[PDB]
Design a protein around this ligand. Structure first.
Ligand SMILES: *Cc1cc2c(cc1C)nc1c(=O)[nH]c(=O)nc-1n2C[C@H](O)[C@H](O)[C@H](O)COP(=O)(O)OP(=O)(O)OC[C@H]1O[C@@H](n2cnc3c(N)ncnc32)[C@H](O)[C@@H]1O
Length: 809
């Protein structure tokens, strides 16, 4: 038993062993896993074992995929029987809105290896004989997946792990972690102490518990979930093939073949289900493990009834087992995966809702991150720092109670959920604007989506096609192009960075040149291999003092990188996160100057207040820092101010521009605006998937700036070889629907790429999409076909930009 570990993993469940297997197979030395009692003693052993190629999301299709592919090679690897049953999986549409969901999911899977099929009821009768075909309209089918034995899965990964040099001590629970100023760790088991260069928390529902050992709120809550096992069924025994795993979405239950009977479990109402609040307040009772909850069948009876109806053999069969167990839910049901910001060398893999299908893939992910220094592909959706102080256990219970219940609701585009809202993270502006718009949840913040025109509909109305906020966004669009309008942009991520090494810090953290004093420019942080880890505004205020602006979802994601690089290069700087004390305000449109000039004594002429210049001034004797910048592409300023002034400032500006007919606007409006200027959004046109040259960002990337910035020589290798694909811009005539991004694009039979984002263009009266395509298909004038809701629409690459920006005009 060694006293210096390279990587220590707290957890012997199936996600901990996943990481040990992959880290050790990758050749990491001294991998050490510490478990409280025994492997699989957590949630894992009792799991229903369902493993599907299917995911509603986008990049999570790759986690599921990487898992399934590994799980196959695993008997062959270890000598052990993992218990992988692979009949296929089939989600049922029983309503027509559900057929629509399937068409929307299929266009999103087309540009993925994940092989997926929209199938007829005839192919489901042949596939699942005992099924009631009476209301079934269609099915979503993935061949090559099904379920697996969690025990046999975990043990098989351990044998792979041990065999490649991972040491798996148990029982040896951590009782104490102490951070060391040199970035290492001190772990404390009842066996003794040891030092790991990094630590990985994979402690299931104890994750929150262990996180506190180094003073962290991990927003996780154990949830009660039951499933049911029947006795043998004669018609089930009589089938020659194994039934494919079903999901009657409209009943909200999954079902599968267990031996010669049926295993099924529902997701009860968010009002009906139970959570382990007591375990967050008091912590998990010690001496818990290899252990279940008392069943509560009566609370899911409504759902059993439905199950009996879709599959009538159940009406006769008998129940053998009711497994009521705990699962670790984060607020949005997604796991928290990656290095935790604020603490050095602490990674997490916690809050897994679907840990058995996620384990393999998440293990290859984290491991490829540890051993490379950057994520292999982009999963900011899974990023552990997407939460914050606002993610209080109050909120954490509410939305998690929702994520459960909403497991099988219809996955709409621009989906909105209201559990736990609003949060503590709100600008003074919120209370002003709430009564007059639809507020979209972004990173805890409440920020408007679209503003209510009077006499027109204001209910929440999601759809796969154009919906009730269509023309209001048009009026908003028309508003900013004609006059002047104000949007709230307080959610931005905001970093101030002063100190002696700061230009040495930013000049290597960024690919663009460092802006002259009193200026701003758009800069990207590349990963060492060349992907766009982040885009953000670099404002240069006092010589050597910088203000960094970024997106609300990409705030702590981006800070973490800046912090770590300051640590690695041993930079002498100071970085504070001023994000919450500042409110932001965009004022954009032709009339911005006429309106803002009358509120300030500062000269706002185009000659005097240049584009991208930053300046300190007072708007109505309210101290503000104004940047001549706008994501709209229209004449405009961003006014950064203290959170208290937001109302007083907003009011002054509204009052002021009443002469020019000033009005409000929001993000939905803002999308349509920027897309016409062909502006790229990080996380959309670009993220860790993409490098800046192929995303058409050559403009912001000075490959001959003297500094060997993070990612330079990588890029120089890309530029030298030449791109394989390039980001283009398309228009298309649609009927009733617009693209939003992640729709597949077709050329003469094959799928050849995808759209990253879309919108209707209110000025040319067509639709607009950004898209990745082969270079042979990337010329201006080139036609492609874009899959939108089951129908292919012809689209054609235009010369970008559609609308010139005010300075270029
Ligand atoms: C309850 C349940 C879960 C479930 C399911 C059905 C039911 C009824 N069906 C699933 C499915 O169809 N598909 C799927 O992918 N997952 C399903 N799940 C459950 C869940 O996703 C998984 O069980 C997931 O693995 C969660 O487990 P995780 O890998 O995160 O870890 P764990 O097994 O819960 O336990 C972690 C281990 O760490 C040890 N520990 C705890 N405290 C300490 C300290 N202080 N020091 C060291 N080690 C510690 C625990 O002993 C535990 O073994």
């Amino acid at each position: 038993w060694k006293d210096r570990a390279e990587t220590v993993i707290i957890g012997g469940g199936c996600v901990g062993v996943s990481l040990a297997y992959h880290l050790a197979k990758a050749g990491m030395k001294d991998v050490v896993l510490l478990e409280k009692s025994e492997l699989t003693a957590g949630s894992t052993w009792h799991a229903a074992g369902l493993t599907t190629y299917f995911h509603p999301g986008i990049n999570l299709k790759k986690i599921h995929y990487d898992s399934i592919k590994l799980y196959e090679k695993l008997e062959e690897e270890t000598g052990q029987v993992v218990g992988f049953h692979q009949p296929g999986s089939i989600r049922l549409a029983t309503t027509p809105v559900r057929v629509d969901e399937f068409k929307y999911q299929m266009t999103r899977t087309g540009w993925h290896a994940t092989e997926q099929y929209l199938i007829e009821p005839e192919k489901i009768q042949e596939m699942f004989p005992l099924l009631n075909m009476n209301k079934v309209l269609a099915g979503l089918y993935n061949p090559g997946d099904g379920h697996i034995d969690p025990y046999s899965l975990t043990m098989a990964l351990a044998a792979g792990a041990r065999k490649c040099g991972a040491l798996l001590k148990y029982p040896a629970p951590v009782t104490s972690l102490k951070a060391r100023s040199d970035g290492t760790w001190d772990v404390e088991t009842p066996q003794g102490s040891m030092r790991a260069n990094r630590i990985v928390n994979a402690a299931g529902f104890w994750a929150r518990e262990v996180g506190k050992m180094i003073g962290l709120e991990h927003p996780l809550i154990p949830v009660q979930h039951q499933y049911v096992v029947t006795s043998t069924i004669p018609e089930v025994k009589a089938l020659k093939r194994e039934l494919p795993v079903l999901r009657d979405l409209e009943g909200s239950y999954y079902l599968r073949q267990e031996r010669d009977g049926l295993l099924f479990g529902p997701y009860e109402s968010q009002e009906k289900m139970k959570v382990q609040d007591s375990w967050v307040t008091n912590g998990v009772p010690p001496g818990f493990g290899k252990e279940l909850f008392e069943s509560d069948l009566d609370r899911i009876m409504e759902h059993i009834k439905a199950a009996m109806e879709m599959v009538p053999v159940l009406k006769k069969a008998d129940i053998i087992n009711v497994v009521n167990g705990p699962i670790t839910y984060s607020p949005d049901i997604l796991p928290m995966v990656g290095p935790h910001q604020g603490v050095r060398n602490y990674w997490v893999a916690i809050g897994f809702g679907y840990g058995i299908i996620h384990a393999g893939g998440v293990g290859k992910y984290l491991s490829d991150w540890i051993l490379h220094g950057e994520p292999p592909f982009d999963l900011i959706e899974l990023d552990p720092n997407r939460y914050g102080k606002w993610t209080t256990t109050q909120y954490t219970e509410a939305k998690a109670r929702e994520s459960y219940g909403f497991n099988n609701i219809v996955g709409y585009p621009k989906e909105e959920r209201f559990a736990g809202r609003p949060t503590q993270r709100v600008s003074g502006l919120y209370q002003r604007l709430e009564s007059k718009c639809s507020m979209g949840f972004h990173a805890g913040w409440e920020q408007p989506h679209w503003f209510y025109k009077p006499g027109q509909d204001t209910q929440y109305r999601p759809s796969f096609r154009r919906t009730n906020w269509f023309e209001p966004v048009g009026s908003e669009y028309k508003q900013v192009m004609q006059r002047v309008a104000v949007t709230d942009l307080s959610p931005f991520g905001k970093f101030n960075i002063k100190g002696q090494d700061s230009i040495r810090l930013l000049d290597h953290l960024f690919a663009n040149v460092i802006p002259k004093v009193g200026f701003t420019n758009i800069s990207h942080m590349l990963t060492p291999k060349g992907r766009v880890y982040a885009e953000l505004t670099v404002s240069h205020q006092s010589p050597g003092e910088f203000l960094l602006i970024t997106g609300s979802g990409s705030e702590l994601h981006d800070l973490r990188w800046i912090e770590e690089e300051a640590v690695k290069g041993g930079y002498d700087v100071e970085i504070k996160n001023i994000t919450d004390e500042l409110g932001v305000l965009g004022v954009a449109g032709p009339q911005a100057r006429k309106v803002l000039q009358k509120l300030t004594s500062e000269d706002l002429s185009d000659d005097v207040f240049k584009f991208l210049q930053t300046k300190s001034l007072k708007v109505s004797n309210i101290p503000v820092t104004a940047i001549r910048i706008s994501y709209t592409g229209e004449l405009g300023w961003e006014l950064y101010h203290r959170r208290e002034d937001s109302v007083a400032l907003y009011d002054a500006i509204m009052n002021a521009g009443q002469e020019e007919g000033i009005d409000n606007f929001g993000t939905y409006a803002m999308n349509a605006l920027r897309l016409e200027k062909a502006f790229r959004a990080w996380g959309l046109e670009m993220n860790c998937d993409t490098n800046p040259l192929e995303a058409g960002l050559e403009y912001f990337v000075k490959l001959n700036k003297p500094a060997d910035f993070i990612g330079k020589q990588a890029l120089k290798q890309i530029k030298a070889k030449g791109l394989k694909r390039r980001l283009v811009c398309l228009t298309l005539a649609t009927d009733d629907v617009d693209p939003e991004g992640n729709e597949s694009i077709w050329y003469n039979g094959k799928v050849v790429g995808n759209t990253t984002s879309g919108s209707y263009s209110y000025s040319i009266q067509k639709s607009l999409a950004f898209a990745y395509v082969p270079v042979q298909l990337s010329e201006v004038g080139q036609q492609v076909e874009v899959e939108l809701l089951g129908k292919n629409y012809p689209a054609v690459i235009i010369q970008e930009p559609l609308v010139l920006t005010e300075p270029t005009r």
